[PDB]
Amino acid sequence: GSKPFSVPVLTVEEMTNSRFPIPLEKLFTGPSSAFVVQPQNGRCTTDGVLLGTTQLSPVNICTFRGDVTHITGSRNYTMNLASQNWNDYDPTEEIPAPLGTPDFVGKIQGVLTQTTRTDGSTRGHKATVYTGSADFAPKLGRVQFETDTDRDFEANQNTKFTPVGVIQDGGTTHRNEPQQWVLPSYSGRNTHNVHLAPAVAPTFPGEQLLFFRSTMPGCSGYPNMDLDCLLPQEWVQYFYQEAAPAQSDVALLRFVNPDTGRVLFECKLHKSGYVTVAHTGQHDLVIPPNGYFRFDSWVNQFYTLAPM
């Protein structure tokens, strides 16, 4: 009679994407046989074990901290990464990359901020990191930023990157980037990623993944702003805190409409931390804004869900 598992009573709009620091907006299901679904943020087992590059607070996702070195003759800077608490970076943890590192290939725009310790002077500049760059190597402790300055960043001073959104440019077709299911090479071009959370896929006939979807802000061009995570950040936080043991491989959840008292759909929360539904095709779910998920029963992986 183990500690009862549960999911939080939070509506979709009350929750947060686990792959970029923005609120959730909607639920989406579609086929995924054409890509490999292996995000590294928003990965957590139902009994509370964090996976991949997943950490607990949503505001740290896609942030970087460290020291910057100017690439003379350009407006580009190399960041030598620190830990999130500004201590030295320890690359020996058995993780793919620092926790919270971006887990998709794209051009992420935001702001580099810096403080000079001696006098508390500060400065902030637009900056973009291309996580598909050959020199994107956060696991090695190095990432490059393109900025709007060649002079107003000091070396050897604490510097932070705050993400804002994504861009599309450099001749790509509209909405051809970011590529949210393409993992970076965390140690640089032509290196192999390590310690990854596994890829996920529906295995039961008639099932698709259920995605928790947000729209990333766009900062220039015609980017693909869709961003799907496998678990809301709040579910990561909740499972980590509760650490309730899984009694089977699959937790059956019902999505409840409090305005009618009726179930809108049911789904499988797999103990390794992803959700499936019985549907074939691309579908934007139409949900009551006060709807929420409710854990009802531990079932087997071969339970047949009610179609939705």
Ligand X SMILES: C[C@@H]1O[C@@H](O[C@H]2[C@H](O[C@H]3[C@H](O)[C@@H](O)[C@@H](O)O[C@@H]3CO)O[C@H](CO)[C@H](O)[C@@H]2O)[C@@H](O)[C@H](O)[C@@H]1O
Q: Which residues bind ligand X (CB under 6 A)?
A: 121-123, 152, 169, 220-222
* Closer to its own copies by Cβ: residue 179 or 193: 179
> Shortest gap between Cβ of 152 and ligand X (angstroms)?
5
Number of residues forming the site for its own copies (CB under 8 A): 51
Asked if 23 touches its own copies (CB under 8 A), the answer is yes
Q: What is the DSSP letter of 289?
A: T
Partner whose binding site includes residue 21, from its own copies, ligand X, none (CB under 5 to 8 Å by kind): its own copies
> Shortest gap between Cβ of 219 and ligand X (angstroms)?
8
Bridge partners of residue 44, in order along the sequence: 50
Contact 211, 27 (CB under 8 A): yes
How far apart are the C-alpha atoms of 62 and 126, rounded to whole Å?
15
* Closer to its own copies by Cβ: residue 60 or 69: 60
Q: How many Cα neighbours within 13 Å face the side chain of 15?
A: 32
Q: Among 38, 41, 54, 109, which residue sits at the site for its own copies (rule: CB under 8 A)?
A: 109
Residues 153-192 that bind its own copies (CB under 8 A): 160, 162, 164-165, 167-168, 174-175
How far apart are the C-alpha atoms of 93 and 97, rounded to whole Å?
9
> Shortest gap between Cβ of 201 and its own copies (angstroms)?
29
State the binding string over 217-256 for its own copies (x if CB under 8 A, else -): xxxxxxx-x--------x--xx--x---------------
Is residue 52 packed enough to be buried (19+ CB in 10 Å), middle (13-18) or exposed (0-12)? buried
Quick one: which segment of 111-119, 131-139, 253-261, 272-280 binds its own copies (CB under 8 A)?
111-119
Closest Cα partner for 11 from 247, 234, 242, 275? 234
Partner whose binding site includes residue 169, from its own copies, ligand X, none (CB under 5 to 8 Å by kind): ligand X
Q: Among 85, 92, 118, 190, which residue sits at the site for its own copies (rule: CB under 8 A)?
A: 85
DSSP of 140-200: GTEEEEEES-SSS--SSS-EEEEEEEEE--TTPPTT---BTT----TTSTT----SPPPPB
> Shortest gap between Cβ of 128 and ligand X (angstroms)?
10
Compute CA 130 distance to the chain's CA centroid, rounded to the nearest angstrom. Answer: 16
* Closer to its own copies by Cβ: residue 170 or 205: 170
Closest Cα partner for 1 from 298, 300, 306? 298
Q: Among 59, 194, 199, 306, which residue sits at the site for its own copies (rule: CB under 8 A)?
A: 59
How far apart are the C-alpha atoms of 178 and 180, rounded to whole Å?
6
List all residues 6 or more positions away from 196 whose beta carbon is below 8 Å from its beta carbon: 38, 40, 52, 96, 183
* Closer to ligand X by Cβ: residue 132 or 221: 221
Which residues form the interface with its own copies (CB under 8 A)?
A: 8-10, 13-16, 21-23, 25, 56-60, 84-85, 109-111, 113, 115, 119-124, 126, 160, 162, 164-165, 167-168, 174-175, 217-223, 225, 234, 237-238, 241, 289
